[PDB]
Amino acid sequence: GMTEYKLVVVGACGVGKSALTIQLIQNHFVDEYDPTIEDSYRKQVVIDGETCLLDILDTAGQEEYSAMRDQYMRTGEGFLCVFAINNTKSFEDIHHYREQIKRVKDSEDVPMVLVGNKSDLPSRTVDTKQAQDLARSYGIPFIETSAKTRQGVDDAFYTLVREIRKHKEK
Ligand SMILES: C[C@H]1CNCCCN1c1nccc(-c2noc([C@@]3(C)CCCc4sc(N)c(C#N)c43)n2)n1
Ligand SMILES: Nc1nc2c(ncn2[C@@H]2O[C@H](COP(=O)(O)OP(=O)(O)O)[C@@H](O)[C@H]2O)c(=O)[nH]1
Ligand SMILES: [Mg+2]
Ligand SMILES: [Mg+2]
């Protein structure tokens, strides 16, 4: 059938991984979605004229280092590394998620996008320049999103598929 893209959404608890995934696939904002639910969700989309299927793993729960969890994460072809623009700690944690992804993928060149979520909020603690500089330093795109208003949500996932396509074209 059509090309499938296994995407994995990672980042600190409470940044909006579930709200972003629900908004992308179901087209509505679910506030306070159960923080413990970790599951995969499917959506057929058209990106740059090419029809494809997105299989998105919305991660949750405890930090676990096992052969099983490493292999589950290893199935990811692209990663959305999410922080909240009003939570400095979630931004400071980004390097850790990227380190674990590079470890399980056994590569420095893994399709990835840095996502700064909750752009609708007025309490910003991480400025656009700081996040743009971090993404540039990693060689990845940076997208600001709001799972609430849908601003940047499709741009973040579509950009990640484009990174996968570009990696596969190399
Ligand atoms: C930032 C740290 C600091 N420690 C204190 C608590 C907060 N943290 C925390 N919490 C919860 C989860 C994680 C965390 N770090 O990587 C990951 C993921 C899922 C990403 C993809 C690649 C792999 S491979 C593997 N085995 C993973 C696992 N479990 C992961 N998840 N990190
Ligand atoms: N205002 C605002 N709140 C958001 C946004 N995304 C998520 N939230 C809220 O942030 C909290 C954590 O969201 P959630 O999807 O559970 O994050 P997760 O732990 O990364 O899955 C909830 O109270 C959501 O309502 C957003 O873009 N804007
Ligand atoms: Mg969640
Ligand atoms: Mg909120």
Side-chain angles (χ1 to χ4, degrees):
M2 61 174 73
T3 299
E4 299 196 10
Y5 294 104
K6 186 68 194 185
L7 312 181
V8 184
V9 187
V10 306
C13 188
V15 300
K17 304 178 293 298
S18 293
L20 288 164
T21 306
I22 297 168
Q23 180 63 262
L24 177 87
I25 303 154
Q26 302 295 313
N27 313 302
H28 59 99
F29 177 57
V30 173
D31 75 338
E32 303 189 308
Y33 183 72
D34 193 323
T36 76
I37 304 169
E38 169 174 289
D39 205 357
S40 290
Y41 307 90
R42 295 165 150 248
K43 200 194 182 185
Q44 185 185 293
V45 299
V46 182
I47 306 170
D48 306 333
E50 179 160 11
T51 312
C52 62
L53 173 64
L54 311 182
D55 188 335
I56 304 162
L57 171 58
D58 169 33
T59 67
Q62 219 165 67
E63 193 184 356
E64 173 196 337
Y65 300 99
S66 63
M68 201 93 60
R69 189 136 184 92
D70 282 355
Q71 183 48 57
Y72 191 33
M73 296 302 148
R74 189 173 288 122
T75 70
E77 288 177 86
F79 300 78
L80 279 193
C81 292
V82 187
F83 72 97
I85 62 146
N86 65 342
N87 177 349
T88 302
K89 182 66 187 140
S90 71
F91 179 69
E92 290 167 343
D93 281 354
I94 291 294
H95 78 278
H96 178 78
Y97 293 93
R98 174 166 171 92
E99 288 161 17
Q100 295 312 310
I101 290 161
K102 293 191 313 180
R103 185 186 53 82
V104 301
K105 296 301 290 181
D106 192 23
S107 176
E108 287 297 310
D109 193 27
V110 175
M112 201 170 294
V113 172
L114 183 66
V115 173
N117 191 41
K118 308 192 185 186
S119 72
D120 60 286
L121 292 177
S123 43
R124 180 195 289 273
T125 60
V126 182
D127 58 67
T128 295
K129 168 139 219 84
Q130 267 191 287
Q132 278 176 336
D133 291 0
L134 190 66
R136 180 213 31 82
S137 91
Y138 292 165
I140 71 182
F142 168 64
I143 309 291
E144 279 206 3
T145 65
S146 172
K148 186 171 176 181
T149 67
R150 204 197 174 89
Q151 183 80 14
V153 176
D154 300 70
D155 184 16
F157 288 90
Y158 285 24
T159 295
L160 179 57
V161 169
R162 291 183 190 115
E163 290 298 298
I164 297 169
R165 288 176 177 169
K166 292 194 298 198
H167 180 90
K168 296 206 297 194
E169 265 91 75
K170 294 202 249 192

